[PDB]
Amino acid sequence: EVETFAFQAEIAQLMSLIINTFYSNKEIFLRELISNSSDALDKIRYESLTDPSKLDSGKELHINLIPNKQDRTLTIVDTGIGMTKADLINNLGTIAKSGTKAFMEALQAGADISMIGQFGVGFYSAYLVAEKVTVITKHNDDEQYAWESSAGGSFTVRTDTGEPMGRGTKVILHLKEDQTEYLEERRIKEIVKKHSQFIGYPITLFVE
Numbered sequence: 001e002v003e004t005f006a007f008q009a010e011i012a013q014l015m016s017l018i019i020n021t022f023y024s025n026k027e028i029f030l031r032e033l034i035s036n037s038s039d040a041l042d043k044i045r046y047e048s049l050t051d052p053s054k055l056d057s058g059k060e061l062h063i064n065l066i067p068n069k070q071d072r073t074l075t076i077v078d079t080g081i082g083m084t085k086a087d088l089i090n091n092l093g094t095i096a097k098s099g100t101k102a103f104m105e106a107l108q109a110g111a112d113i114s115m116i117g118q119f120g121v122g123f124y125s126a127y128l129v130a131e132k133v134t135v136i137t138k139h140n141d142d143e144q145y146a147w148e149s150s151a152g153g154s155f156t157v158r159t160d161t162g163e164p165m166g167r168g169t170k171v172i173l174h175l176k177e178d179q180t181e182y183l184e185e186r187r188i189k190e191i192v193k194k195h196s197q198f199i200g201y202p203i204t205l206f207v208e
């Protein structure tokens with residue numbers, strides 16, 4: 001059973017700008033997603049201090065980068081706090097409306113797309129390199145969900161019957177055909193070293 005939702009108008013406009021604007025410095029998507037993982041890991045660690053049972057779904061706190069040339073996917077997996085259905089369906093888009101307008105206005109004022117994370121909407125930089133983004137996520141006391149969007153104004157949510165994750169978030173980037181450099185070991189390593197050097201969790205770059 002698949003539910004289809006419309007993006008808020010401001011978010012659809014943001015995704016169209018990210019897809020249509022000429023901007024060569026696309027590699028910033030990876031820093032934004034690793035930062036979101038790091039924040040998610042921070043939060044489950046923080047909450048586990050007053051409720052240790054929140055780590056019953058997994059004590060290890062890490063980030064995995066997994067390229068797959070055959071599927072043309074780059075997957076970023078973390079064991080952070082995960083997202084609820086409400087996070088996916090309504091609540092994150094609500095928060096993102098304010099930051100989106102501010103980011104739009106800053107871009108008109110001379111800001112650069114690489115500043116997107118200062119407005120809380122860095123996730124959408126995934127569309128610099130991906131034609132479709134699939135997000136698998138598991139929050140404690142909620143189901144495992146698959147969120148998915150190829151832009152165009154809509155996204156889907158379904159309960160996910162794939163491999164159980166325990167807890168956390170998996171962002172699957174289905175790369176555009178001219179963006180396969182982000183499947184190369186040397187390129188991913190260069191980007192992580194340049195932009196994600198001080199992340200406070202082990203980042204493992206898988207190879208094939």
Ligand SMILES: O=C(c1ccc(O)c(Sc2ccc3c(c2)OCCO3)c1)N1Cc2ccccc2C1
Pocket residue numbers: 032033034036037039040043078080081082083087088092093123135137147168169171
């Ligand atoms: O679970 C996550 C997570 C982890 C790694 C990521 O790259 C992303 S990207 C992303 C962002 C927004 C979305 C979306 C994907 O999909 C559809 C709805 O809104 C999210 N949390 C949870 C959590 C709690 C506190 C602070 C920061 C965070 C982040």
